[PDB]
Design a protein around this ligand. Sequence first.
Ligand SMILES: CCCCNC(=O)c1ccc(Cl)c(S(N)(=O)=O)c1
Ligand code: NA
Ligand SMILES: [Zn+2]
Length: 258
Amino acid sequence: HHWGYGKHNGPEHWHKDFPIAKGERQSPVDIDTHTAKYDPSLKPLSVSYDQATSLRILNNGHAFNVEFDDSQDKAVLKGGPLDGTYRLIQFHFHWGSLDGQGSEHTVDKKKYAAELHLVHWNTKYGDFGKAVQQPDGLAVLGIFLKVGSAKPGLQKVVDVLDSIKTKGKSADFTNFDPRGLLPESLDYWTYPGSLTTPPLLECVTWIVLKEPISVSSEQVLKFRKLNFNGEGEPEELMVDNWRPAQPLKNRQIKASFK
Ligand SMILES: CCCCNC(=O)c1ccc(Cl)c(S(N)(=O)=O)c1
Ligand code: NA
Ligand SMILES: [Zn+2]
């Protein structure tokens, strides 16, 4: 009886195994755009993904992760609200059963069809597992997806999904360029929060881009053909793998713009 996204093991249950679920800096949150504070001292985000080396794509039973070689200073995020350098380790998505839901963060209560998370760890802690134990261990770049025109740089991901349909499947997945997943603008909101999945550790500086990317109906439909179950087990479509907005508590969301 492990955590997941259903009635009996979904987000409202996670606190029993992971009591930090009711902690002081949980994610995601609703971004109230009128109360976010513009901070003119915030710097442009620096996304340096030219030398990224993707390795593999994995269905972990909760989402799919595209993993990168994080053993050198390739694929780094810096600037913005961050001190120092954070290295890309993986990205994944959260999405809905329907186009009207799927994102984890919300914007003035609006839900997007999906949300991309590019996960980075602070190089001062040497590796991801030590970084998650620190309050400034991770930086996650969150990007909303709306359904409209296709995102051509997403198609390589969608096309490999058939090979990782069920929990535990993985495939070689080299030469994927995550630049093709970014919107034009790097304007962002930022706040201190947590992993949105167990173990829910309170180690993340969230950087949420204001501009969504568009993906096609066909592209998101292929995400919804994945399975939470393993091969040879009864089919449970991988949909609605998002945690709802959590209390803001004693936090301020800052804007890099307007
Ligand atoms: C036990 C791994 C379960 C799947 N969750 C993940 O792989 C995962 C890892 C790190 C982060 Cl920062 C996040 S998120 N959603 O970006 O907060 C998710
Ligand atoms: Na369409
Ligand atoms: Zn995530």
